[PDB]
Design a protein around this nucleic acid. Structure first.
Ligand SMILES: Nc1ncnc2c1ncn2[C@@H]1O[C@H](COP(=O)(O)OP(=O)(O)NP(=O)(O)O)[C@@H](O)[C@H]1O
Ligand SMILES: Nc1ncnc2c1ncn2[C@@H]1O[C@H](COP(=O)(O)OP(=O)(O)NP(=O)(O)O)[C@@H](O)[C@H]1O
Ligand SMILES: Nc1ncnc2c1ncn2[C@@H]1O[C@H](COP(=O)(O)OP(=O)(O)NP(=O)(O)O)[C@@H](O)[C@H]1O
Ligand SMILES: Nc1ncnc2c1ncn2[C@@H]1O[C@H](COP(=O)(O)OP(=O)(O)NP(=O)(O)O)[C@@H](O)[C@H]1O
Ligand SMILES: Nc1ncnc2c1ncn2[C@@H]1O[C@H](COP(=O)(O)OP(=O)(O)NP(=O)(O)O)[C@@H](O)[C@H]1O
Ligand SMILES: [Mg+2]
Ligand SMILES: [Mg+2]
Ligand SMILES: [Mg+2]
Lengths: 362, 362, 362, 362, 362
DNA sequence: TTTTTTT
């Protein structure tokens, strides 16, 4: 009897496998009998115990196949084709909604019955983040809106502030919440032609640790980053398409992704300042300094600086009507799971402890 | 009347063979008659004598085949696929435990009565390795826990020290103990793309003797290694997935493995220093040199650079409760086997022989 | 009827042929009728006249075949597979023993009545070579021991000296005796990876005529060779496995071969000096030049470069107990044959002729 | 009916096509009718008029084939395979004898009544060539001996001298006589790999016109040639096998061809000077210049550059005993042709015309 | 029914189509009905309307084919194979005859009843171009004979100096007349390798506006071109085959084309100028500027750059016996046509109007 | 596709 290549493609699509060897290995595990399958009995991984019954008959015949890598290549090209169609055709709200749905899938297993995530440390992460900046959750919601709207000139945000003030901390978290990448624009004028190519097909970008020409009289190191950005005018504005180039690849023309500029207390050109819609002064405060050394429970299990923590902050603080109509259904379920586990008095006391510069107690 | 591709894949899985030519060669040895087979009678290699009788029928048909390399390729891809599956599904504790089980099986063969290793020579290696760094067994244990608790930014260790100070010796031993690959990054960056691809699904990587800039006043030649690593910060920091590539095969998107950077007294950039959680300064010690001169079996048999010598050290020094519960049973068996072969007084006499620079085993 | 692919593999395996065009060319000579084959009647090449009668039937069908190169590719891959199986499963002493057996077979053909060699001229080569270095036969024996034991870091020998001092001569002789490849590291670093890939599954490598900097006062031109070798420290160490690369094949991980570096009075970094266990300083001897001018048959027949000359030297000078058990029975036959042919007086006449700078056979 | 791949291979072997498109084009010309064929009637090209009648049937079927390039690839691979077997299995003296026989076949066609040439003009070439260097026939005979004997390190010759001194002229004539190819080593060092790959399986190479870095005070432009050539010291030696490389094929290991270096009066390093056995100082002569202006048929017909002029010179000047036994028969009938058509008084008149700086035919 | 691969090859041969996608596109236009075909009604492109009726039956079956690119590949390879055979076997005089035949075919369509070109405007082009140099008829015929006879080291011409004096104009016309390509040697020396691969199988090259280091006092920009040409002086002379090279293709061995160099007055090195045998230079005429100004169609229709204009010039002012015999029957037809519908009174009136700087046609 | 070309 014949292998169904369509069934293999269904498994690849349902699990979003873009790797031919991962697909081959996982599918070969289904060749063993379901009735006695230890992995289905003890339910380690969802990509197995959901699918083994449906695919067992096909996987037996697949294990006898002489074509196995060809079958998987076609299935992986089907998944790559769906990604490519979605990239060109989705509206930018739907792209972010797909990212949030994927993060909620990670939530549902990360905080699963097998969940190594306790709600408690993740909610302490949320309270740390919500204490970092005045009216923080509006700042995150405003960031997502301007990044989704992608409106010309009114795109890039300037994070200006002292060292050890948390600016890389939040920028690195927003890359995980949205998808995106960071660029090192400090280079001489020639090499940044290739560095800018890192933005190709990204949803979002950040310019990290931009050095300026001035500030040596304040013991800031001089560097050409800011003077470069004043020349990258059209990439910021996003009014016209720019041609972007990569290591031994030919140029792509697209609108440059929106982003964030993270900068110390450097002086800026008036032209560059006029091209940032929002300036946020990050400034350090000592009770957060003291809280951190008191609170390694934020830094273990990667909870700080992770975008899944910022999503949890949005679920806790925003009204449900602000999320997309398709994800509103899943977000109310995560609302009530937070409501049950973290009563408002427990959260308030935890945030009060953060205001007192101390970790979780009681 | 036709080749079972399934039996060949089964042999490759049982042998854990990642190389197409190795599989082709070994499987072709089975084409000759089992009854007259000198290798089965002489019992040279287990990969032959355990399997010849079972595979003889299939190997005779395989020797006539017109497809041989294609059959081997599918088998080898099955073994690489199981490695991908295990790398994505298993916890790092289980990965290290599987490696210890493989090493302990190899110890049972090697110290068995059918074996060839005198355990006295291997315990002399333990004595010599415990002299190399203070509290070596806690240092090995700390390294193991660091590679298991893969905490971002806190993933990499730096070994520093002059010529013949023991850096490569301990890195090679930890590498065998944990499993991993050595990478040379002294080559230029565009050619490192396929070098870095060797880290696919490995537990450790070691960056062997990376060359810095400067140091010519210390008679150290310059090279690109440090500058290349400083261009790879997300691979060291491990905050986000990177794309690793192999020829004529699709890329792998994974977090790059943790491990060891080794170097000879070069100056290290502050940005790179921020990513090495512990630095060990090796010193040349003349008593170890004099001991090795008089105990050349340690270097001829490669005992002091072997992971089996470090695994014997962990069995000797560490509690049972520090090992994973699956493997505790055969570890306590190995402890009583060590207590059988050695008094503590023999081991203290060995370590005194080392410290005095006289021959160990005297 | 149809072509036997197995017989083509059997010919390839018997001739140890790993070039696909060489196999194709030789097997096509068997097309023509065995009864009248001029090469069989003249007995030019053993690879032809031994095999034509057996393969004539298969070669006639092979000449009509439409996929000839595909047959030869499978045959060549079988030869490479056995070579890789031998490389992992044999001890280095067995590998040297197998190599000497192959050399002794070639000597039996050279010095038999069918052979074109004169054993007096080859023993004149042994006389000339024994004059090159002090205790030459022990230097060869110590080298063989070094290559068999393959001790970490104690693996490479450095041959140093001026122009026409004999470095390349001895290196070529040891390369034929042990088997191995010569590599040029003077070419630029970014293409050097494919040159290093020639080392795969080889017993020795010889880095020939490496250039340094800082000889220009001596009138030695500058070059990158020594800088490249200092980037390849972990390859020369042989503690860890290194990733070796052929075109269109994925990397193989193996311990890099031991061997020889030949160099002309350049300065060596102390880091690189730590990888060499012995340095041999070759000094030009005018009596050897005057001897060669008068005995040009040594250069024309390439006797003093040959491994067969060093094998004769070992048979003349070394005890039988220094050879491996399997070859001692052939070595005693060869010792008797040499003692029959050469009195010590004839040899001491030759060695005195060399020292006088006379024609060695005079 | 089926196309015979054997007949295509036979045509390629008899024509010695190592070009797939040349074979395809040539063989497709046989698809048209033999009786009407204008190319056969005119007898333009021997590769057509000898073979069309025999191959007509097969070429008609081949024109209907869907496999045409695959058929020609096998034929071309068979011609290359024979060439590689002959490289590894012939003596260099047989290789030269074969080349002379091929040039004598050309001479039979050139100076036969079908041919365009006539011997008087080519014998004037011999007279002009004999005037260029003293004892030119011994020089050419010594060169042939040097290239046949291929003595290690005593196997490259240097042609040195001013602009327009005859260096490239004589090198080209020797290159056509012996076969082999010219290499341009003035390129940058990283491209050089593929240039040197042209030498694979060749009998000679000529390093044309290498530039040095001195002598700009002599108005000689500087360049990298001599420095590149000093990196290739082990290639010029010919003691070891070097690893040659052509695009998209992995490396081939062989002894580099012997050859000629042509050079203006740049300073040469002692390391590279040691690898030349003989230096020929060309000096320009005004009577030769005046002669060529008046006898320009020598340049138009390229008689001055041709290997056939040097072969005619050897036939006129050397004993029949100096030729290989197989070719001595054709040499005596060629000597008889020359004696019959040229009196020594005509040839001495020609030599006297050249010395008088007047047109050779007057 | 099956596709005739033979008919696709016929079409490609008759179209001289050496591009696979062009062939595929052209042939897929033939699948639609011949009787309704708008392109055959409008008669836009000759490669369509001449061939569609013949090929319709085969093109409909070809549209249903699953092999379509494989069919076109075989066809294109046949066209390239004929070009290879022609390059090796044709005399240069036959090559130039073929080029003239193809240009006369264009002239028949271009001045046909369907032709979009008024022959008067092109004859006015003959009037302008006849004035550009003293007796242009002689220089062009001398150039053509020089390019046919191809005498080694005596086969390049230089145009130097004045701007707006016609150097590139006449070079472009000679280049279309003969066939061949322009080269820009000022590229980086690494790129110069690929630059020269444009000359592969070309009949001419023009080195265009090549630049040197000096001449600053004449306001000439510096450049590396002449320094690169000196590395190629052995390519220019054509005494020997050179290993020309292009991206991703193995080197090809051939004699470099003859050509023209256009240049500004840099000081050309002796080692390079010794490989050139003409300099011919231009002087701007004020009345010609006025004639172009008053007869702009000479530039707008690209008349004076074109090879058809020089062929018309040669058809007028050289005798029929100076062309190759095969084409003389077509040249008498064009002589009659031009002497019919134009008169020497009209031509001398045009060259008069040109001498007056007024509009040519009146 | 990788290698080569690009960096
Ligand atoms: N109020 C604070 N006081 C001190 N440290 C803080 C404070 N808030 C955050 N941090 C910590 O500062 C560390 C560095 O965060 P980061 O976002 O890199 O700061 P930054 O301002 O971008 N520093 P720099 O990258 O040097 O410009 C993180 O561990 C934060 O948790
Ligand atoms: N601390 C030590 N003191 C003395 N000898 C030692 C020590 N460690 C190692 N050795 C010897 O030195 C050899 C090389 O040690 P190795 O680990 O390669 O040194 P390393 O520090 O990596 N030197 P390098 O890589 O050249 O910077 C070992 O094989 C031992 O013979
Ligand atoms: N010790 C010696 N004294 C004199 N002549 C020698 C000596 N050894 C070799 N020769 C001659 O020199 C030739 C080349 O020897 P070779 O081994 O290439 O020397 P080398 O020291 O490697 N020279 P180089 O390669 O230029 O650095 C041999 O073929 C002999 O003719
Ligand atoms: N010795 C000579 N004296 C005078 N004219 C000569 C001599 N040899 C050659 N010629 C002429 O000079 C031309 C160039 O000779 P050729 O051998 O190419 O020069 P070359 O010495 O190699 N110069 P170069 O190419 O710069 O290395 C030939 O075509 C002859 O016309
Ligand atoms: N003899 C001439 N009298 C008047 N105009 C001329 C003449 N020759 C050329 N021109 C015009 O000059 C312009 C440029 O000619 P062109 O041949 O491209 O210049 P060029 O000499 O190659 N200059 P350059 O490209 O710098 O080498 C065109 O408009 C021509 O029509
Ligand atoms: Mg920061
Ligand atoms: Mg020359
Ligand atoms: Mg111009």
């Amino acid at each position: 009897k014949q292998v169904s290549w369509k069934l293999v493609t269904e498994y690849a699509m349902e699990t979003k496998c873009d790797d031919v060897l991962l697909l081959l290995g996982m599918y070969l595990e289904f060749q063993y009998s379901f009735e006695m399958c230890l992995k289905c009995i003890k339910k380690e991984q969802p990509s197995h115990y959901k699918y083994h019954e449906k695919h067992y008959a096909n996987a037996a015949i697949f294990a006898d196949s002489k074509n196995q890598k060809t079958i998987c290549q076609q299935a992986v090209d089907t998944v790559l084709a769906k990604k490519r169609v979605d990239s060109l055709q989705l509206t930018r709200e739907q792209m972010l909604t797909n990212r949030f749905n994927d993060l909620l899938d990670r939530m549902d297993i990360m905080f699963g019955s097998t969940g190594s995530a306790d709600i408690e440390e993740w909610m302490a992460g949320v309270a740390w983040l919500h204490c970092l900046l005045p009216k923080m959750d509006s700042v995150v919601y405003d960031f997502l809106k301007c990044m989704v709207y992608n409106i010309p000139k009114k795109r890039y945000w300037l994070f200006k502030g002292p060292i050890d003030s948390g600016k890389t901390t939040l920028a690195a978290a927003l890359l995980e919440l949205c998808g995106g990448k960071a660029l090192n624009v400090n280079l001489p004028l020639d090499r940044l032609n290739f560095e800018l190519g890192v933005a190709i097909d990204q949803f979002l970008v950040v310019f990290e640790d931009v050095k300026g020409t001035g500030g040596e009289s304040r013991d800031l190191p001089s560097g050409q980053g800011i003077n470069n950005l004043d020349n990258l005018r059209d990439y910021l504005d996003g009014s016209v398409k720019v041609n972007l180039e990569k290591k031994h690849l030919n140029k792509r023309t697209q609108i440059f992704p929106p982003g964030i500029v993270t900068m110390n207390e450097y002086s800026v050109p008036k032209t560059l300042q006029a091209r940032f819609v929002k300036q946020i002064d990050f400034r350090p405060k000592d009770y957060l300094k003291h809280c951190l050394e008191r609170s390694e429970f934020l830094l273990e299990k990667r909870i700080i600086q992770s975008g899944i923590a910022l999503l949890l902050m949005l679920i806790w603080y925003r009204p449900v009507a602000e999320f997309a109509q398709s994800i509103q259904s899943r977000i109310v379920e995560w609302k009530e799971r937070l409501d049950k586990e973290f009563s408002l008095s427990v959260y308030q006391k935890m945030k009060f402890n953060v205001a007192m510069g101390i970790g979780v107690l009681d």
